[PDB]
């Protein structure tokens, strides 16, 4: 059993530095690249950066270059992210994820997330357009979620489900490849710029947020999400 275990909730003063951790179990730590993702309101997901644990090589989203430093402790099989000059804008849930599984790899295992509170006291990036932004349906309806890329990205699109108070869960990788344990009602299609996630019959347990992600170009990017909700 593979697991990514993150350190507990944090609450800090503005201007502080903070190091949060992600400890692995059940596999060889140096196998797969680690990624850090910031969850903000919407919910919205942003990719911070990545570290290759075998040699410590990194790649960052330019937006977070002056803010976060990724590192690994190979002897402790633990990945770390260190923030500096923390402000109210950094209050968020931060997730660690590994980019692994059967080849070709994707963000298959995620940490449970770490809530970070910064207390007030007493241009060429691939754009992913998701539509419809909201789908209000009754269980048993058949739905299709769209993800349109700003330029051709071949089959480098992955789909995630994010339910309230939970970590993102990989549903489909590389536009159409199925994931072990994911129910057969979820399927994906598309290549180039138009990608579709289909849910053959919406179940009550499917309500939540759906995000698409591209991994063809740096920085890795997410769509703004489609909210799948119960029709009033």
């Amino acid at each position: 059993e593979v697991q990514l275990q993150q350190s507990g909730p944090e609450l800090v003063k503005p201007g502080a530095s903070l190091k949060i951790s992600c400890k692995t179990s059940g596999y060889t730590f140096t196998d797969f690249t680690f990624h850090w993702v910031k969850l903000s309101h919407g919910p919205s997901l942003e990719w911070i950066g990545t570290i290759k644990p075998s040699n410590g090589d990194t790649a960052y989203n330019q937006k977070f270059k002056g803010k976060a430093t990724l590192s690994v402790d190979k002897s402790a099989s633990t990945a770390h992210i260190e923030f500096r000059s923390l402000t109210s804008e950094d209050s968020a849930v931060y997730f660690c994820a590994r980019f692994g599984g059967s080849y070709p790899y994707a963000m298959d295992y995620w940490g449970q997330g770490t809530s970070v509170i910064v207390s007030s006291g007493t241009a060429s990036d691939i754009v992913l357009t998701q539509s419809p932004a909201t789908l209000s349906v009754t269980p048993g309806d058949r739905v299709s979620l769209s993800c349109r890329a700003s330029q051709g990205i071949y089959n480098y699109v992955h789909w995630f489900q994010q339910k309230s108070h939970e970590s993102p869960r990989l549903l489909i990788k590389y536009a159409s490849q199925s994931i072990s344990g994911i129910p057969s009602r979820f399927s994906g299609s598309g290549s180039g710029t138009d990608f579709t996630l289909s849910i053959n019959s919406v179940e009550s347990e499917d309500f939540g947020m759906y995000f698409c992600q591209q991994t063809n170009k740096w920085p890795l990017t997410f769509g703004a999400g489609t909210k799948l909700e119960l029709k009033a």
Binding site: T33, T50, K52, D57, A59, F99, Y103, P104, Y105, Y154, Y156, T215, N216, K217, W218, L220
Partner: peptide, 9 residues
């Protein structure tokens, strides 16, 4: 395919 060397190899 600029990310393949880092992510997949």
């Amino acid at each position: 395919n600029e990310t393949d060397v880092f992510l997949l190899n």
